[PDB]
Design an enzyme around this catalytic site. Structure first.
Site, short mmCIF file in Angstrom:
data_model
loop_
_atom_site.label_atom_id
_atom_site.label_comp_id
_atom_site.label_asym_id
_atom_site.label_seq_id
_atom_site.Cartn_x
_atom_site.Cartn_y
_atom_site.Cartn_z
N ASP A 1 -11.79 -75.93 21.32
CA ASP A 1 -13.10 -76.56 21.40
C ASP A 1 -13.25 -77.63 20.33
O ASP A 1 -14.30 -77.78 19.70
CB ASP A 1 -14.21 -75.52 21.28
CG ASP A 1 -15.52 -76.00 21.84
OD1 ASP A 1 -15.51 -76.88 22.73
OD2 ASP A 1 -16.56 -75.51 21.37
N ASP B 1 -16.24 -73.36 13.76
CA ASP B 1 -16.58 -72.61 14.97
C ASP B 1 -15.39 -72.22 15.82
O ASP B 1 -15.03 -72.93 16.77
CB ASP B 1 -17.58 -73.37 15.84
CG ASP B 1 -18.42 -72.42 16.70
OD1 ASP B 1 -17.85 -71.45 17.24
OD2 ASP B 1 -19.63 -72.63 16.82
N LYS C 1 -14.23 -80.92 19.04
CA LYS C 1 -15.23 -81.90 19.44
C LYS C 1 -15.99 -82.32 18.19
O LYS C 1 -15.95 -81.61 17.18
CB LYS C 1 -16.18 -81.33 20.50
CG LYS C 1 -16.80 -79.99 20.14
CD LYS C 1 -17.82 -79.56 21.18
CE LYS C 1 -18.29 -78.14 20.93
NZ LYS C 1 -19.31 -77.75 21.92
N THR D 1 -15.18 -78.03 26.18
CA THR D 1 -16.28 -78.91 26.51
C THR D 1 -15.80 -79.99 27.48
O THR D 1 -14.76 -80.60 27.24
CB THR D 1 -16.85 -79.55 25.24
OG1 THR D 1 -17.26 -78.52 24.34
CG2 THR D 1 -18.03 -80.43 25.57
N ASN E 1 -18.17 -79.84 16.09
CA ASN E 1 -17.49 -78.80 15.35
C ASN E 1 -16.81 -79.31 14.10
O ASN E 1 -16.01 -78.59 13.50
CB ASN E 1 -16.49 -78.09 16.28
CG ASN E 1 -17.20 -77.13 17.21
OD1 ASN E 1 -18.30 -76.70 16.91
ND2 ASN E 1 -16.58 -76.82 18.36
N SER F 1 -26.03 -68.98 19.50
CA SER F 1 -25.99 -68.77 18.06
C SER F 1 -26.87 -69.80 17.36
O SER F 1 -27.19 -70.87 17.90
CB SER F 1 -24.56 -68.85 17.53
OG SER F 1 -24.02 -70.15 17.75
N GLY G 1 -28.00 -75.67 12.41
CA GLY G 1 -27.63 -76.16 13.73
C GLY G 1 -27.64 -75.04 14.75
O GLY G 1 -27.96 -73.89 14.44
C1 LIG Z 1 -20.54 -76.37 13.87
C2 LIG Z 1 -20.92 -75.70 15.19
N1 LIG Z 1 -22.38 -75.78 15.42
C3 LIG Z 1 -22.82 -74.79 16.41
C4 LIG Z 1 -22.62 -73.36 15.93
C5 LIG Z 1 -22.84 -77.18 15.67
C6 LIG Z 1 -22.77 -77.45 17.20
C7 LIG Z 1 -24.27 -77.49 15.13
N2 LIG Z 1 -24.32 -77.72 13.68
C8 LIG Z 1 -24.14 -76.67 12.81
O1 LIG Z 1 -23.91 -75.53 13.17
C9 LIG Z 1 -24.19 -76.96 11.36
C10 LIG Z 1 -23.48 -76.10 10.51
C11 LIG Z 1 -23.50 -76.34 9.15
C12 LIG Z 1 -22.76 -75.55 8.17
C13 LIG Z 1 -22.82 -75.62 6.76
N3 LIG Z 1 -21.98 -74.79 6.15
N4 LIG Z 1 -21.32 -74.17 7.16
C14 LIG Z 1 -20.33 -73.22 7.04
C15 LIG Z 1 -19.78 -72.68 8.13
C16 LIG Z 1 -20.32 -73.20 9.43
C17 LIG Z 1 -19.81 -72.67 10.67
C18 LIG Z 1 -18.81 -71.73 10.80
C19 LIG Z 1 -18.55 -71.40 12.16
C20 LIG Z 1 -19.37 -72.09 13.02
S1 LIG Z 1 -20.44 -73.12 12.20
N5 LIG Z 1 -21.26 -74.10 9.54
C21 LIG Z 1 -21.77 -74.62 8.41
N6 LIG Z 1 -24.18 -77.38 8.60
C22 LIG Z 1 -24.87 -78.22 9.43
N7 LIG Z 1 -25.60 -79.27 8.87
C23 LIG Z 1 -26.54 -80.14 9.50
C24 LIG Z 1 -27.24 -80.31 8.15
O2 LIG Z 1 -27.28 -81.65 7.63
C25 LIG Z 1 -26.18 -79.35 7.58
C26 LIG Z 1 -24.89 -78.03 10.81
#
Ligand SMILES: CCN(CC)[C@@H](C)CNC(=O)c1cc(-c2cnn3ccc(-c4cccs4)nc23)nc(N2CC(O)C2)c1
Length: 290
Positions: A126, A147, A128, A167, A131, A16, A11
């Protein structure tokens, strides 16, 4: 880059990307949030160290789990345990059966993550949908709060002007009034999220951001017919306690966990499939991508 192999993008954030990665010696998979340096500002190293410090602190089954923090010249790397279930809202819209009991279970896990932040002096700021991640269905499908790039550390229940962040759709009235604020801003966002979980569209919206803010500052949300007529009064009541514009009167996460719709969900939450919520959520998700 000497210790991790990078794979596909999961993502996107403001400055980032998150990519799945593997630690080359052990073969263990992880997720790396890779923060770029397109934007340079005064307190850069203070912001990055704060995000890492807050992430190191938070160990909870409903919060992402930090593994390592790596500083390079052009990028910073926050390595987390990998979860493979994707975004919560993308999971919901793929369900064929989705009811208030299912929304209540989601919100309960969100509430546990938020309560754990607040007890540790962390305001996320944040909250939402994007996240909110999911552990894999094979692993139990626990909701994971992610996040902490905007999160702040607070001293107990003391409140202050900590800046304008978050947001638009989820900003709290106290922030929009530029009043001092704290932990309650997360319960406000939790209330916006709960509303969307029930009917699939937001409580505050206007294509004109100035009118969106006017509506939030008034706290003027409602439960229109017909879709809300099938929603239990207890669910509406919990929304009411979260979306009050006086943060002093707003329910806390610890209190919300004791609400009957949350802690007596089998007897209080409706089990009716809400197909219109799924339909609207699909549109809601699609618009947020564009
Ligand atoms: C969440 C915030 N994001 C912007 C930075 C959103 C807007 C966009 N989406 C993703 O970043 C995303 C992240 C992950 C994911 C998997 N393990 N993990 C462990 C730690 C973290 C994080 C830690 C601190 C910030 S993120 N993220 C993940 N898996 C996803 N998915 C879609 C697919 O099916 C698997 C999508």
């Amino acid at each position: 880059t000497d210790e991790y192999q990078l794979f596909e993008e999961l993502g996107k954030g403001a400055f980032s990307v998150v990519r799945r990665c593997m630690k080359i010696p052990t073969g263990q998979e992880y997720a790396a949030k890779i923060i770029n340096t397109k934007k340079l500002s005064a307190r850069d190293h203070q912001k990055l160290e704060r995000e890492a410090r807050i992430c190191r602190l938070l160990k909870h089954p409903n919060i992402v789990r930090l593994h390592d923090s790596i500083s390079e010249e052009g990028f910073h790397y926050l390595v987390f345990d990998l979860v493979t279930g994707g975004e919560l809202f993308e999971d919901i819209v793929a369900r064929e059966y989705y009811s208030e009991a299912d929304a209540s279970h989601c919100i309960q896990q969100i509430l546990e993550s938020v309560n754990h932040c607040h007890l540790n002096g962390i305001v996320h700021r944040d909250l939402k949908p994007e996240n909110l991640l999911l552990a894999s269905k094979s692993k139990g499908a626990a909701v994971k709060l992610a996040d902490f790039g905007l999160a702040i550390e607070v001293q107990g229940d003391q409140q202050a002007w900590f800046g304008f962040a978050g947001t638009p759709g989820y900003l709290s009235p106290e922030v929009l009034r530029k009043d001092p604020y704290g932990k309650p801003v997360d319960m406000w966002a939790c209330g916006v999220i709960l509303y969307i979980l029930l009917v699939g569209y937001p409580p505050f919206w206007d294509e004109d951001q100035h009118r969106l803010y006017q509506q939030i500052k008034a706290g003027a949300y409602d439960f229109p017919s017909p879709e809300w007529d099938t929603v239990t009064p207890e669910a509406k009541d919990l929304i009411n306690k979260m979306l009050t514009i006086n943060p002093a009167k707003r329910i806390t996460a610890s209190e919300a966990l004791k609400h009957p719709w949350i802690c007596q969900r089998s007897t209080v939450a409706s089990m009716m499939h809400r197909q219109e919520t799924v339909d609207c959520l699909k549109k809601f998700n699609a618009r947020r991508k564009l």
